[PDB]
Amino acid sequence: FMTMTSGTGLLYSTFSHYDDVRPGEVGQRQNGVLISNGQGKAVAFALFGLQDRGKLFLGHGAEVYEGQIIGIHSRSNDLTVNCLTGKKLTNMRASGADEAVVLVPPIRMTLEQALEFIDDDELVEVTPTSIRIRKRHLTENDRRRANRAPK
Amino acid sequence: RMKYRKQQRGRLKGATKGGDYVAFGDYGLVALEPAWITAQQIEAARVAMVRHFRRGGKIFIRIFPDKPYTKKPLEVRMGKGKGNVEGYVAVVKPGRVMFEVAGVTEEQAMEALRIAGHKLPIKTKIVRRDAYDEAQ
Amino acid sequence: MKVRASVKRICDKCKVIRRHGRVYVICENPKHKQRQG
Amino acid sequence: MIQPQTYLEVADNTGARKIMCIRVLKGSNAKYATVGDVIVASVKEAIPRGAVKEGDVVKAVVVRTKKEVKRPDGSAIRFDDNAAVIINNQLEPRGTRVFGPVARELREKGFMKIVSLAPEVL
RNA sequence: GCCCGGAUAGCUCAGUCGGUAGAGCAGGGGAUUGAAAAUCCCCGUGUCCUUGGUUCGAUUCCGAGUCCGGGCACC
RNA sequence: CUCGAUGUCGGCUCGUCGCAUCCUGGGGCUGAAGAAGGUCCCAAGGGUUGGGCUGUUCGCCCAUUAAAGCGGCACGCGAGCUGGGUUCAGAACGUCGUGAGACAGUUCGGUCUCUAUCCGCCACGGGCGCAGGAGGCUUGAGGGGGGCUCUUCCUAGUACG
RNA sequence: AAGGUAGCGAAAUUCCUUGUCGGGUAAGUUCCGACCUGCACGAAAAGCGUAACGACCGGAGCGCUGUCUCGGCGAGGGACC
RNA sequence: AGUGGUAAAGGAUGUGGCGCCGCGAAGACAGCCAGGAGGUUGGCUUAGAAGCAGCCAUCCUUUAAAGAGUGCGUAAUAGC
């Protein structure tokens, strides 16, 4: 709101009567959030594959855990990729060519730039030297337990 | 593709002209400068068309998955019984009567073909019914 | 934008510009910078 | 005077007034942990207690032995090789340390603290 | 890096030359006991992993993703 | 063509061209505010670090870096080195073989020569000449050398907001 | 014909192998230690171990040193007149 | 165009050539002028369609001859 009217715009609220939420979802945010599939570390060979499917958060060896988000999806759907692994080493044989994929970094921040990123249940787990963001339900299969939609 | 329950292993190689022409619905795709064409590629077109066409009212056919192409080995050195069966397809060479319907009613069908074959694999042309044909 | 090929105009009224054997499509939308020469 | 691989001396909150640097922190083409410079290293020598450890920081260049040639044709050499360990920013490591004065240092400047800190005889 | 593989309920797991979805254990209701184990009937829960194609309809036959799959590699 | 003979690896040292250019810039494009990315066309100019382990080039890892490219030339280089290498006999076992002997299973050692003739390159001179015989100062067509780049600070957080 | 015991194991036998853990280490397919699903160990061509002794072969680390960051000048011998 | 002086898929208001289409001097097209007409005003959605928000509508009067409105759009609407 403050970004629409540019400060010059105030308006609060309260309630008129306990409803039922209607039938539609009030977001729910676009571009699904990229979640992890287990604790470990960021693997160049792991974050390289599905990298064009949106943006990334952490880097490498960045070793996060389950439920922790590590970027946003190119669409609205949500997934739980994985990699460390990054695999695999190594040789011989043999050589010499070739290839040497790189990778872009954050994309990091802010807080302040990641908090409002949530929507359903992505507690922005913060620390006295770090700031993470995971879903109310780490385990993937666990999330489906609460959804479970109709009827 | 489909060249099911064949009978033999392999053909041979040549090419030059044949007997495709008619019409058969008025939505036609005719080859012109080819030879054999992957049963697959073929299905490709099949798809292309099928999908474009609001995805329903049927197209028809034309050639067949006809012969068995062999690159034999995998990349060895050469002297195998020339065995190995591997890619099956059409053998159409002089601008052939390739026939595809649907009920597009238009340059819509056009497009369908356009891509289907533009794709497929050769210098080719398309049209409709131009000089009927009388049989016994 | 460019491409050693393609170009079948676009911006609904995207222009087929003849310039130096330069198959260059000109429009009113950067999205169409069609340089295929 | 300089070195890449190095058994150097320090005297800050050192694990031991000694660490081995890899190289020079300057213009990508090291070859000189030089007087009044800033570079990279890990520990070589021991460390009673101390929050230091057997890790690696970077830091700034003190002494040398093979010509401290100054702008004012001030000249000197100490039969000693050592610098002060840094914490990120540069902000030095320890509370104090065993050594003293002379241009080159302060001159590099960024480390006044080192500056007033190591003053007197030694 | 080519080459196969598994993806099915709460967790471990099969499918006429498609058209139907299952035991097991968790599990709550019993039969049972003196009460309980064990055992025997019953409930329930179904994304049949995401796409594109074939068909009247595909969990299944095909295309792609998907953890997953055994393997390729002297100058 | 080559078996009247063409030294195969790895590395060294001196490298030379190439662009599908990595850092460089010039750029239109953005889902481009700024910044920063990312998306193609132009252009090789210079530039295009140390170690670790591995006989391995490839590779994975440490530390940076503007950056730490792909590759052409018998995977450049023995008439210029190196020679761990895989590849003469040993002996080793692990493995086949009735065993003789064997395994592109492996592991320990394992006698790389070179007085240049030619054209070629690096230099330095002797000629004979650019129609008087001379001492010395020039101008260059044309050819050669070097054209990189950091980070900080300057206008810097008013551009975007 | 029974079907490998005891000890022993990724080893002068593990190709999947830079196996996996651990240690060493800024980093290590290197070796030491573990594990042991032993591509293909085993007692008599010995098996596990075993001090002293090896121009044994391999892995650390202190010491020292133009050896290495290029080396730089120097003397003696040919090279050259 | 330097094609001469190797190349395909395929792309195109290239160049020139057909053998063809628009000419209501009831004087043409790009360039021009002005009006861009009243029922056109839900059908849902109307927070808005009252052509310029989505599931089709295919009628009428009426003259510059008539847009069941091809298009810049938000809150309909209002303007091009």
Side-chain angles (χ1 to χ4, degrees), chain D residues 37-51:
Chain D
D37 271 321
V38 272
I39 53 293
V40 61
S42 147
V43 68
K44 205 190 173 198
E45 305 208 65
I47 175 199
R49 319 304 180 166

PDB file of all heavy atoms in Angstrom, chain D residues 37-51:
ATOM      1  N   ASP D  37      51.964  -4.241   4.294  1.00  0.00           N
ATOM      2  CA  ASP D  37      50.890  -4.737   3.423  1.00  0.00           C
ATOM      3  C   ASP D  37      49.819  -5.552   4.141  1.00  0.00           C
ATOM      4  O   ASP D  37      49.827  -5.640   5.332  1.00  0.00           O
ATOM      5  CB  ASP D  37      51.475  -5.560   2.290  1.00  0.00           C
ATOM      6  CG  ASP D  37      51.823  -4.716   1.094  1.00  0.00           C
ATOM      7  OD1 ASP D  37      51.031  -3.793   0.800  1.00  0.00           O
ATOM      8  OD2 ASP D  37      52.869  -4.979   0.452  1.00  0.00           O
ATOM      9  N   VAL D  38      48.894  -6.157   3.416  1.00  0.00           N
ATOM     10  CA  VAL D  38      47.864  -6.949   4.078  1.00  0.00           C
ATOM     11  C   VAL D  38      47.685  -8.261   3.345  1.00  0.00           C
ATOM     12  O   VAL D  38      47.526  -8.291   2.138  1.00  0.00           O
ATOM     13  CB  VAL D  38      46.572  -6.157   4.151  1.00  0.00           C
ATOM     14  CG1 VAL D  38      46.585  -5.317   5.438  1.00  0.00           C
ATOM     15  CG2 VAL D  38      46.447  -5.249   2.913  1.00  0.00           C
ATOM     16  N   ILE D  39      47.692  -9.368   4.074  1.00  0.00           N
ATOM     17  CA  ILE D  39      47.644 -10.651   3.402  1.00  0.00           C
ATOM     18  C   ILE D  39      46.937 -11.796   4.072  1.00  0.00           C
ATOM     19  O   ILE D  39      46.251 -11.577   5.062  1.00  0.00           O
ATOM     20  CB  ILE D  39      49.046 -11.091   3.071  1.00  0.00           C
ATOM     21  CG1 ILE D  39      49.938 -11.055   4.311  1.00  0.00           C
ATOM     22  CG2 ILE D  39      49.613 -10.150   2.069  1.00  0.00           C
ATOM     23  CD1 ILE D  39      50.215  -9.654   4.856  1.00  0.00           C
ATOM     24  N   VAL D  40      47.166 -13.016   3.568  1.00  0.00           N
ATOM     25  CA  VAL D  40      46.459 -14.209   4.083  1.00  0.00           C
ATOM     26  C   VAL D  40      47.169 -15.298   4.848  1.00  0.00           C
ATOM     27  O   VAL D  40      48.217 -15.704   4.453  1.00  0.00           O
ATOM     28  CB  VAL D  40      45.809 -14.986   2.938  1.00  0.00           C
ATOM     29  CG1 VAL D  40      46.876 -15.470   1.970  1.00  0.00           C
ATOM     30  CG2 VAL D  40      45.081 -16.179   3.478  1.00  0.00           C
ATOM     31  N   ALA D  41      46.554 -15.856   5.881  1.00  0.00           N
ATOM     32  CA  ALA D  41      47.221 -16.949   6.570  1.00  0.00           C
ATOM     33  C   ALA D  41      46.448 -17.768   7.585  1.00  0.00           C
ATOM     34  O   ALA D  41      45.349 -17.447   7.957  1.00  0.00           O
ATOM     35  CB  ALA D  41      48.462 -16.434   7.214  1.00  0.00           C
ATOM     36  N   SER D  42      47.079 -18.851   8.023  1.00  0.00           N
ATOM     37  CA  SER D  42      46.537 -19.770   9.027  1.00  0.00           C
ATOM     38  C   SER D  42      47.617 -19.878  10.072  1.00  0.00           C
ATOM     39  O   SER D  42      48.718 -19.383   9.887  1.00  0.00           O
ATOM     40  CB  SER D  42      46.313 -21.181   8.468  1.00  0.00           C
ATOM     41  OG  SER D  42      46.531 -22.192   9.462  1.00  0.00           O
ATOM     42  N   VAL D  43      47.319 -20.541  11.175  1.00  0.00           N
ATOM     43  CA  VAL D  43      48.339 -20.677  12.201  1.00  0.00           C
ATOM     44  C   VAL D  43      49.345 -21.757  11.883  1.00  0.00           C
ATOM     45  O   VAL D  43      49.077 -22.691  11.114  1.00  0.00           O
ATOM     46  CB  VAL D  43      47.738 -21.036  13.549  1.00  0.00           C
ATOM     47  CG1 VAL D  43      47.175 -22.438  13.470  1.00  0.00           C
ATOM     48  CG2 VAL D  43      48.800 -20.919  14.641  1.00  0.00           C
ATOM     49  N   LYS D  44      50.523 -21.598  12.464  1.00  0.00           N
ATOM     50  CA  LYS D  44      51.543 -22.601  12.313  1.00  0.00           C
ATOM     51  C   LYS D  44      51.818 -22.968  13.764  1.00  0.00           C
ATOM     52  O   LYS D  44      51.689 -24.124  14.171  1.00  0.00           O
ATOM     53  CB  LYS D  44      52.809 -22.028  11.629  1.00  0.00           C
ATOM     54  CG  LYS D  44      53.680 -23.096  10.886  1.00  0.00           C
ATOM     55  CD  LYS D  44      55.062 -22.599  10.399  1.00  0.00           C
ATOM     56  CE  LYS D  44      55.954 -23.721   9.840  1.00  0.00           C
ATOM     57  NZ  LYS D  44      57.395 -23.352   9.757  1.00  0.00           N
ATOM     58  N   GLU D  45      52.115 -21.956  14.565  1.00  0.00           N
ATOM     59  CA  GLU D  45      52.455 -22.205  15.947  1.00  0.00           C
ATOM     60  C   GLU D  45      51.305 -22.339  16.933  1.00  0.00           C
ATOM     61  O   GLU D  45      50.254 -21.737  16.751  1.00  0.00           O
ATOM     62  CB  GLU D  45      53.461 -21.148  16.404  1.00  0.00           C
ATOM     63  CG  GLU D  45      54.696 -21.087  15.516  1.00  0.00           C
ATOM     64  CD  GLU D  45      55.960 -20.614  16.234  1.00  0.00           C
ATOM     65  OE1 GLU D  45      56.431 -21.314  17.150  1.00  0.00           O
ATOM     66  OE2 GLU D  45      56.501 -19.548  15.878  1.00  0.00           O
ATOM     67  N   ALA D  46      51.548 -23.154  17.974  1.00  0.00           N
ATOM     68  CA  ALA D  46      50.623 -23.496  19.084  1.00  0.00           C
ATOM     69  C   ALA D  46      49.812 -22.335  19.683  1.00  0.00           C
ATOM     70  O   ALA D  46      49.844 -21.226  19.149  1.00  0.00           O
ATOM     71  CB  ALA D  46      51.408 -24.237  20.227  1.00  0.00           C
ATOM     72  N   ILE D  47      49.083 -22.598  20.775  1.00  0.00           N
ATOM     73  CA  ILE D  47      48.263 -21.567  21.425  1.00  0.00           C
ATOM     74  C   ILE D  47      47.659 -21.926  22.754  1.00  0.00           C
ATOM     75  O   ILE D  47      46.568 -22.482  22.823  1.00  0.00           O
ATOM     76  CB  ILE D  47      47.057 -21.109  20.566  1.00  0.00           C
ATOM     77  CG1 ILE D  47      46.199 -20.123  21.376  1.00  0.00           C
ATOM     78  CG2 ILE D  47      46.214 -22.311  20.139  1.00  0.00           C
ATOM     79  CD1 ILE D  47      44.800 -19.958  20.851  1.00  0.00           C
ATOM     80  N   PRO D  48      48.350 -21.621  23.837  1.00  0.00           N
ATOM     81  CA  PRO D  48      47.665 -21.993  25.063  1.00  0.00           C
ATOM     82  C   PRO D  48      46.305 -21.320  24.961  1.00  0.00           C
ATOM     83  O   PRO D  48      46.197 -20.243  24.379  1.00  0.00           O
ATOM     84  CB  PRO D  48      48.533 -21.362  26.129  1.00  0.00           C
ATOM     85  CG  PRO D  48      49.075 -20.152  25.430  1.00  0.00           C
ATOM     86  CD  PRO D  48      49.469 -20.715  24.105  1.00  0.00           C
ATOM     87  N   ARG D  49      45.277 -21.973  25.488  1.00  0.00           N
ATOM     88  CA  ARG D  49      43.907 -21.449  25.471  1.00  0.00           C
ATOM     89  C   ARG D  49      43.681 -20.441  24.348  1.00  0.00           C
ATOM     90  O   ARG D  49      43.838 -20.766  23.177  1.00  0.00           O
ATOM     91  CB  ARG D  49      43.595 -20.796  26.820  1.00  0.00           C
ATOM     92  CG  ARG D  49      44.137 -21.574  28.014  1.00  0.00           C
ATOM     93  CD  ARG D  49      43.621 -23.003  28.023  1.00  0.00           C
ATOM     94  NE  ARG D  49      44.116 -23.773  29.159  1.00  0.00           N
ATOM     95  CZ  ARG D  49      43.609 -24.942  29.548  1.00  0.00           C
ATOM     96  NH1 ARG D  49      42.590 -25.485  28.894  1.00  0.00           N
ATOM     97  NH2 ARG D  49      44.108 -25.570  30.604  1.00  0.00           N
ATOM     98  N   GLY D  50      43.308 -19.222  24.719  1.00  0.00           N
ATOM     99  CA  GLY D  50      43.089 -18.181  23.736  1.00  0.00           C
ATOM    100  C   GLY D  50      42.052 -18.504  22.687  1.00  0.00           C
ATOM    101  O   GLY D  50      42.077 -19.567  22.078  1.00  0.00           O
ATOM    102  N   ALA D  51      41.142 -17.561  22.471  1.00  0.00           N
ATOM    103  CA  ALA D  51      40.075 -17.722  21.495  1.00  0.00           C
ATOM    104  C   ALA D  51      40.613 -17.686  20.062  1.00  0.00           C
ATOM    105  O   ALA D  51      39.854 -17.790  19.092  1.00  0.00           O
ATOM    106  CB  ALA D  51      39.027 -16.624  21.697  1.00  0.00           C
TER     107      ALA D  51
END
